[PDB]
Amino acid sequence: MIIIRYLVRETLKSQLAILFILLLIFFCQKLVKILGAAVDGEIPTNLVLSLLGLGIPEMAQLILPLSLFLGLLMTLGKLYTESEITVMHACGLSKAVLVKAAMILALFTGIVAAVNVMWAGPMSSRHQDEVLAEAKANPGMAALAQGQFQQATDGNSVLFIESVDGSKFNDVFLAQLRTKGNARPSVVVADSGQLAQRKDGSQVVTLNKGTRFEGTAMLRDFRITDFQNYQAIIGDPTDTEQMDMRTLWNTDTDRARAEFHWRITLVFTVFMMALIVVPLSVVNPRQGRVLSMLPAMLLYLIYFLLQTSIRSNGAKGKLDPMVWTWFVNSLYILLALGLNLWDTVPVRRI
């Protein structure tokens, strides 16, 4: 009761500092993503602040298990180097107290991650969808329009521009790459071009006062069109899984099944990781700390990579997310018990 409170207070201080650092890192990453998508012409400084503060449950999803995991590593390492855990063991206390305190902290962080996943995730996603669907014309019109000479396998078409005066082209030239049964590639050329996307989801390209030259294979027949106002379809942070737990339970579609198992496994990861980290927290004076945490950090990274791959593949119909998600969890629980029991009386004799 006293030692368990000690371990909880110390691991909480560490976990709070690690959470602050992790927040700064993930804030930087999200700022990079938002400011990149904004100068592309999608949001101004009034939406930057909201979106930066609003995507913090997605950050929490990954950092809460991580903050508990790194906090337990760091704090148990600090009390191992300071000879405190050793004198606990010299006073008869075994790893039971450590894994108890671990599972208590796992409970706390699990309640917070569960509240996050159940309520704070979908609410913020719905608010983000409504805000992004509100102002869409001003985004599109803010198109940087800096694709000067850009042609590849993006619809198999060529686009060239001479000069750009900000969201406007000069001497625009569009060409096709499809032969289409021995015919001339479609060629169009105009003087003013504007790019506007995200109107419904597809990319739209609009030109003004252009000429379209088409024809057949080196026969003198030509189709010369003088078009006035041209609109074609030559071709980001939008949210789709913004449902409650009830709707996910009742949907039973591929996307919904994947998202639901992802949310549960994400709230389970707290307890699972806190259970694995307890016997992998001893540091060696030879390796130091960062090197002694390295296999445990690798387990954590491998676990999250599997889970993200399972979600991405299941929501597209490649696997059953339930089977693979809980098979991975089973294997990780077995590994936890394996390296949690090996240093005990029954398994030492074993």
Binding site: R223, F227, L298, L301, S309
Partner: protein
């Protein structure tokens, strides 16, 4: 915790790395289009002026709003003018004409001066002009109302099929 761990970190980094490696309504709108269709040996076939044109690339179909087609001869002389309210252009160079289909004879040498119908089909390669609804052929001396029309602009001919009546102006057209 040095000896076997070397292989443990090896295998774990290997798995992480391979995991990172594995884890790593129209289509064509326009308006007021001036297309000039030329013959395969140069020269010129006709000119189509539309006020608004949509095109679906999925089906390869075009719709022309308020079309005006001026067809010429082999010597580049305005022979015919074809106005309509809408036009449907398919992929086989057959043009459908819906609403107020009115064919005027630009060149006064034609015998057929005006044609009025609601639905018409025109084969652009052969300049054929068919119609399955009520048509009216206006001539310099006559006008005939028929239930079907068949003709050709290149040949400057047209006739009516099913129920045909013919009127003249003071006396009849000599024939």
């Amino acid at each position: 915790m040095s000896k076997t761990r070397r292989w443990v970190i090896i295998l774990l980094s290997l798995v992480a790395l391979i995991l990172i490696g594995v884890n790593l309504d129209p289509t064509y709108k326009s308006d007021h289009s001036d297309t000039v269709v030329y013959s395969p040996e140069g020269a010129l076939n006709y000119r189509l002026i539309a006020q608004h044109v949509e095109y679906f690339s999925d089906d390869g179909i075009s719709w022309f709003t308020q079309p005006v087609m001026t067809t010429f001869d082999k010597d580049k002389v305005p022979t015919w003018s074809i106005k309509s309210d809408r036009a449907k252009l398919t992929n086989d160079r057959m043009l459908y004409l819906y609403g107020h289909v009115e064919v005027n004879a630009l060149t006064a040498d034609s015998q057929l001066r005006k044609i009025t119908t609601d639905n018409a089909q025109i084969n652009l390669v052969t300049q054929d002009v068919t119609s399955q609804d009520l048509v009216t052929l206006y001539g310099t001396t006559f006008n005939s109302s028929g239930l079907r029309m068949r003709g050709n602009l290149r040949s400057k001919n047209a006739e009516l099929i099913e129920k045909v009546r013919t009127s003249y102006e003071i006396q009849n057209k000599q024939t």
